Design a protein around this motif. Structure first.
Motif, PDB file in Angstrom:
ATOM      1  N   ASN A   1       1.010  -1.249   0.067  1.00  0.00           N
ATOM      2  CA  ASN A   1      -0.090   0.104   0.051  1.00  0.00           C
ATOM      3  C   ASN A   1       0.890   1.133   0.136  1.00  0.00           C
ATOM      4  O   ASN A   1       1.550   1.393   0.891  1.00  0.00           O
ATOM      5  CB  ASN A   1      -0.704  -0.007   1.235  1.00  0.00           C
ATOM      6  CG  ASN A   1      -0.166  -0.328   2.441  1.00  0.00           C
ATOM      7  OD1 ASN A   1       0.011  -1.516   2.750  1.00  0.00           O
ATOM      8  ND2 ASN A   1      -0.069   0.564   3.507  1.00  0.00           N
ATOM      9  N   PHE A   2       0.854   2.021  -1.258  1.00  0.00           N
ATOM     10  CA  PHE A   2       1.740   3.137  -1.287  1.00  0.00           C
ATOM     11  C   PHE A   2       0.898   4.405  -1.891  1.00  0.00           C
ATOM     12  O   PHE A   2       1.386   5.687  -1.732  1.00  0.00           O
ATOM     13  CB  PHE A   2       2.756   2.810  -2.215  1.00  0.00           C
ATOM     14  CG  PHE A   2       2.548   2.005  -3.439  1.00  0.00           C
ATOM     15  CD1 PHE A   2       1.996   2.968  -4.723  1.00  0.00           C
ATOM     16  CD2 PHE A   2       2.548   0.861  -3.438  1.00  0.00           C
ATOM     17  CE1 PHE A   2       1.472   2.028  -5.445  1.00  0.00           C
ATOM     18  CE2 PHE A   2       2.223   0.051  -4.622  1.00  0.00           C
ATOM     19  CZ  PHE A   2       1.882   0.722  -5.791  1.00  0.00           C
ATOM     20  N   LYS A   3      -0.301   4.201  -2.153  1.00  0.00           N
ATOM     21  CA  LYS A   3      -1.050   5.243  -2.935  1.00  0.00           C
ATOM     22  C   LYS A   3      -1.978   6.124  -1.811  1.00  0.00           C
ATOM     23  O   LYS A   3      -2.343   5.375  -1.008  1.00  0.00           O
ATOM     24  CB  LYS A   3      -2.194   4.870  -4.093  1.00  0.00           C
ATOM     25  CG  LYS A   3      -1.180   4.184  -5.316  1.00  0.00           C
ATOM     26  CD  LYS A   3      -2.238   3.767  -6.150  1.00  0.00           C
ATOM     27  CE  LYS A   3      -1.630   2.725  -7.018  1.00  0.00           C
ATOM     28  NZ  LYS A   3      -2.728   1.634  -7.637  1.00  0.00           N
TER      29      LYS A   3
ATOM     30  N   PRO B   1      -5.156   7.568  -0.054  1.00  0.00           N
ATOM     31  CA  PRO B   1      -6.682   7.254  -0.509  1.00  0.00           C
ATOM     32  C   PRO B   1      -7.086   8.420  -1.393  1.00  0.00           C
ATOM     33  O   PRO B   1      -7.150   9.557  -1.018  1.00  0.00           O
ATOM     34  CB  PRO B   1      -7.111   7.374   1.111  1.00  0.00           C
ATOM     35  CG  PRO B   1      -5.896   6.932   2.002  1.00  0.00           C
ATOM     36  CD  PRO B   1      -4.779   7.566   1.207  1.00  0.00           C
ATOM     37  N   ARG B   2      -7.636   7.901  -2.476  1.00  0.00           N
ATOM     38  CA  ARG B   2      -8.346   8.658  -3.421  1.00  0.00           C
ATOM     39  C   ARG B   2      -9.683   9.390  -3.053  1.00  0.00           C
ATOM     40  O   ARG B   2     -10.344   8.884  -2.193  1.00  0.00           O
ATOM     41  CB  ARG B   2      -8.485   7.801  -4.725  1.00  0.00           C
ATOM     42  CG  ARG B   2      -8.760   8.420  -5.829  1.00  0.00           C
ATOM     43  CD  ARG B   2      -8.872   7.131  -6.794  1.00  0.00           C
ATOM     44  NE  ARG B   2      -7.822   6.784  -7.218  1.00  0.00           N
ATOM     45  CZ  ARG B   2      -7.657   5.304  -6.869  1.00  0.00           C
ATOM     46  NH1 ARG B   2      -8.640   4.874  -6.412  1.00  0.00           N
ATOM     47  NH2 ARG B   2      -6.482   4.526  -7.017  1.00  0.00           N
ATOM     48  N   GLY B   3      -9.904  10.647  -3.514  1.00  0.00           N
ATOM     49  CA  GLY B   3     -10.968  11.362  -3.198  1.00  0.00           C
ATOM     50  C   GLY B   3     -10.683  12.273  -1.939  1.00  0.00           C
ATOM     51  O   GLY B   3      -9.562  12.294  -1.291  1.00  0.00           O
ATOM     52  N   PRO B   4     -11.736  13.232  -1.649  1.00  0.00           N
ATOM     53  CA  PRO B   4     -11.753  13.985  -0.369  1.00  0.00           C
ATOM     54  C   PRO B   4     -11.579  12.929   0.725  1.00  0.00           C
ATOM     55  O   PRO B   4     -11.974  11.922   0.942  1.00  0.00           O
ATOM     56  CB  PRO B   4     -12.952  14.719  -0.224  1.00  0.00           C
ATOM     57  CG  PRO B   4     -13.362  14.758  -1.689  1.00  0.00           C
ATOM     58  CD  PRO B   4     -13.216  13.414  -2.151  1.00  0.00           C
TER      59      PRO B   4
END
Ligand code: MG
Ligand code: MG
Ligand code: MG
Ligand code: MG
Ligand code: MG
Ligand code: MG
Ligand code: MG
Ligand code: MG
Ligand code: ZN
Lengths: 83, 137, 135, 214, 24, 102
Positions: free
Chosen positions: C127-129, C131-134
RNA sequence: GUGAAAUUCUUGGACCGGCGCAAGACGGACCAGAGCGAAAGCAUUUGCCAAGAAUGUUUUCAUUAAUCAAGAACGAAAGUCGGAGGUUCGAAGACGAUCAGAUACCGUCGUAGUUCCGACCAUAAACGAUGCCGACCGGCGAUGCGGCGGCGUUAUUCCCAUGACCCGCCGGGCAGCUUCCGGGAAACCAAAGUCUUUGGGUUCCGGGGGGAGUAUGGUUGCAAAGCUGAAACUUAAAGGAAUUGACGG
């Protein structure tokens, strides 16, 4: 990459390609030999089986057809058959 | 007896105050816990004679002051709150007088219990009034 | 308020500072006296406004470079700040953290199997990304 | 001419034994004169009261209807009538980029009370979740709803109104939904959002007395 | 003139023409 | 001249979107087209939150919030300054404005 | 109730509050540049009935295909006819306001309608103002479906599947960001590109602006109207995209 060698694609990109989009078509499926647990004989089973297979001795089910590839029941050993 | 219960000093008597603050008016309405019996209902219309300031904060605080002195006269100490907008298919936010009435109730010698919203919220309402092109002002 | 120097006094001071550097100094009154002869300023009010800006920039350049450039000052800046001159280079680690992927990359390079570098246990979770979105 | 509050009298409303606190508060009513009867007027009064005010250390976002059936002297004994989550709680639970699942059952209690049970649940994004929206497929929602229906009707159809109320005080049914539905889709925001009564078993007074006592 | 209202005006004129033609 | 690529609405794979009503004038607006503003407000304003807390019988009570979703026709949103006209390049920006929380 | 009011309801209890009942509508928040369907369009739960794309396929037939005059099925809303039902809203109409006037915008009432079944009509800025089939031509991160792989977390259990996440790949979609591929009058478009270096197949269709989608003929329809569809005459511009200024209640 203006000079990609379409003549001799490396095997990892060839496997990466879609089945019909390779330089020569190769099916992704194969043929495997399945051993009925608690039995003695060896049956031939498609990797993408659409029908339920039951070897004569193994009165229980062997494969469950699903979307892409049939589910081997527990205790069934499998091995490829000449590519 | 004597326009009041026989509650001890340690215990407080609980009422229910519906504050239906809409536009153009403000209702402050004190009842019992079930709400079946009503003690006093005062609205901004009977406190300003301008017909424009019925929802004004100046009238809303005066209405809350009158129900506060009436509640204390009747021996009511603690008071739950039920804020209410117009609701239904219409506006769902409380009017201007809600805040002034609530501030007046707290500061005029009253106790506050739980505050809850009793706005009528439809699952999907009827044809709201106005026309498909809205209210052209 | 309202003591902001104009581009006329600023640019005139910048030219005379670069042209006549060793002649100038930290004293305002000396600066206005030298500016009398090294330049022709028709007004006394403009003269000592230029001298004031020269004194301000002389204080600024004696402790660090500014937008103005002096040919000798550039040579002095490079002559100084040679290095921190550590006894040992910062990149001579006796032990080096090395991923297994980089370790086998060195092996295929044929420059692997050296004592200094050591393999570490790779991270698990992938897990490196963000968290997408607000939020 | 005189304010009718001169003739109004004040009665104390009591609580079922499921809660450790017995005094909801106080109601008032006119006295018994001729056609009007004070006892009859007080029949069927619904007292929307908090579960937090009826308990010591439970949650505060719950309300109970608590209709009154009988009056004896200055006391108005009261039985269960319904439960509702407060508007603030349910609104703050409804979030975006997730899936809300709602179910309703109709169950006849062994006592005889017909009850309608609305239960709500919301999906979960994980701790390592990077995808913005954590949605559920339609068949997964159907499986979650159908499992939700049957593990909440099985908790009420096999027990009386006494056990139903005292087991929804901590909502063991709601935690049962959470722990059972995780095999399909994780949920955290699962609560029985509302229960309402539909029928009553013929008003047996002996049941009310043991409800408030033995 | 708005094109829709011009269309309505031509419709009313057409109804007048049809009625007079049928009358004759 | 097409002002916006999406024509001011989030309708790509659809043919019809159910209408909603503006909360200011009750105007039928497509749901994907109206400006949606979800507001979380204090029940008691800041000028009276301390008065209510001191008058509360409970020792530790938290005021509830208002959760109402507002739909505005673009005429009423512009008049209320919910949205403002932007430059030709600034219209392409889709990120929400900062909350000014620091 | 409004900007302010007024029409209007009100000591018969109007409004508000509590408990029930009835009616007909309506499916919020979840609900998103997300899904499906040929479009029109479709959002409470469960069940039944058929249907469908995509994926998977070392299954079968073997050119059975693409577009399509004539013809046909469906086709928002409003409109018509018959019968139910008429909660809300609401053409027309009336009244009160505003105004110099106000046949309106604002407020109250309210008919047809809005709802369901059956029979018509065949039109929308029915819009992506953008035909379908096929090939080729940049990158990137997401999203929906199916499949295929892999460090790991999680659910139960004793192991795998199997669900929920994580990292990737493929194909079909809805899309998005970027790009001096290229194009275009530009706005802009990975199509609206591969066009004077002009030919992949094929339907519909335009020829300055009005007159005019009019007149007439024919045909459809209960009607409203639909389809087809001119001419005389009139005119030097009508328009499209971008630029500067001027102005904006
Ligand atoms: Mg305006
Ligand atoms: Mg449309
Ligand atoms: Mg009146
Ligand atoms: Mg229709
Ligand atoms: Mg009819
Ligand atoms: Mg009306
Ligand atoms: Mg063609
Ligand atoms: Mg022409
Ligand atoms: Zn509006």
């Amino acid at each position: 990459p203006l000079a990609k060698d379409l003549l001799h694609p490396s095997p990892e990109e060839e496997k990466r390609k879609h089945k019909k989009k390779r330089l020569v078509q190769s099916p992704n499926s194969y043929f495997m030999d399945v051993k009925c647990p608690g039995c003695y004989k060896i049956t031939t089973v498609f990797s993408h089986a659409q029908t339920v297979v039951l070897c004569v001795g193994c009165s229980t089910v062997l494969c469950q057809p699903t979307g892409g590839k049939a589910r081997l029941t527990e205790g069934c050993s499998f091995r490829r058959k000449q590519h | 007896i004597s326009l009041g219960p026989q509650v001890a000093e340690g215990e407080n008597v609980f009422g229910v105050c519906h504050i239906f603050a809409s536009f153009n008016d403000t209702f402050v309405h004190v009842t019992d816990l079930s709400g079946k019996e009503t003690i006093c209902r005062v609205t901004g219309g009977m406190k300003v004679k301008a017909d424009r300031d019925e929802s004004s904060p100046y009238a809303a605080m005066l209405a809350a002051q009158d129900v506060a002195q009436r509640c204390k006269e009747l021996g009511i100490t603690a008071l739950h709150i039920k804020l209410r907008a117009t609701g239904g298919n219409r506006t769902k936010t409380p009017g201007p007088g809600a805040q002034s009435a609530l501030r007046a109730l707290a500061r005029s010698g009253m106790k506050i219990g739980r505050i809850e919203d009793v706005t009528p919220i439809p699952s999907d309402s009827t044809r709201r009034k106005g026309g498909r092109r809205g209210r052209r002002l | 308020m309202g003591r902001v120097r104009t581009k006329t006094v600023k640019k005139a001071a910048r030219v005379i500072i670069e042209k006549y550097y060793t002649r100038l100094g930290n004293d305002f009154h000396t600066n206005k006296r030298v500016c009398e002869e090294i330049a022709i300023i028709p007004s006394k009010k403009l003269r000592n406004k230029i001298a004031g800006y020269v004194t301000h920039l002389m204080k600024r350049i004696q402790r660090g470079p500014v937008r103005g450039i002096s040919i000798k000052l550039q040579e002095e800046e490079r002559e100084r700040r040679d290095n921190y001159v550590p006894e040992v280079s910062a990149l001579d680690q006796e032990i080096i953290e090395v991923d297994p992927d980089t370790k086998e990359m060195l092996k295929l390079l044929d420059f692997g199997s050296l004592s200094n570098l050591q393999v570490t246990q790779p991270t698990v979770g992938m897990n490196f990304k963000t968290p997408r979105g607000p939020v | 001419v005189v304010d009718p509050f001169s003739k109004k009298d004040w009665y104390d409303v009591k609580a079922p034994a499921m809660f450790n606190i017995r005094n909801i508060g106080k109601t008032l009513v006119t006295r018994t004169q001729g056609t009007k009867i004070a006892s009859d007027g007080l029949k069927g009064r619904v007292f929307e009261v908090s579960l937090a005010d009826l308990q010591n250390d439970e949650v505060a976002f719950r309300k109970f209807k608590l209709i009154t059936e009988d009056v004896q002297g200055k006391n108005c004994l009261t039985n269960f009538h319904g439960m509702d989550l407060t508007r603030d709680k349910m609104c703050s639970m409804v979030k975006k980029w997730q899936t809300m699942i709602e179910a309703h059952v109709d169950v006849k209690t062994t006592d005889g009370y017909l009850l309608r049970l609305f239960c709500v649940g919301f999906t979960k994004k994980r701790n390592n979740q990077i995808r913005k929206t954590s949605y559920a497929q339609h068949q997964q929602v159907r499986q979650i709803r159908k499992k939700m229906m049957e593990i909440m009707t099985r908790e009420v159809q096999t027990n009386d109104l006494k056990e139903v109320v005292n087991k929804l005080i901590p909502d063991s049914i709601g935690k049962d939904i959470e722990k059972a539905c995780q095999s399909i889709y994780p949920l955290h925001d699962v609560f029985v959002r509302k229960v309402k009564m539909l029928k009553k078993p013929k008003f047996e007074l002996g049941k009310l007395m043991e409800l408030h006592g033995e | 003139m708005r094109a829709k209202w011009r269309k309505k005006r031509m419709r009313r004129l057409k109804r007048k023409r049809r009625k007079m033609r049928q009358r004759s | 001249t097409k002002k916006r690529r999406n024509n001011g609405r989030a309708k790509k794979g659809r043919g019809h979107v159910q209408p909603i009503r503006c909360t200011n004038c009750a105007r039928c607006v497509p749901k994907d087209k109206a400006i949606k503003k979800f507001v979380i407000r204090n029940i008691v304003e800041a000028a009276a939150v301390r008065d209510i807390s001191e008058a509360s019988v409970f020792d530790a009570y938290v005021l509830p919030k208002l959760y109402v979703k507002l739909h505005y026709c673009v005429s009423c949103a512009i008049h209320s300054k919910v949205v403002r006209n932007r430059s030709r390049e600034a219209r392409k920006d889709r990120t929400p404005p900062p909350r000014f929380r620091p």
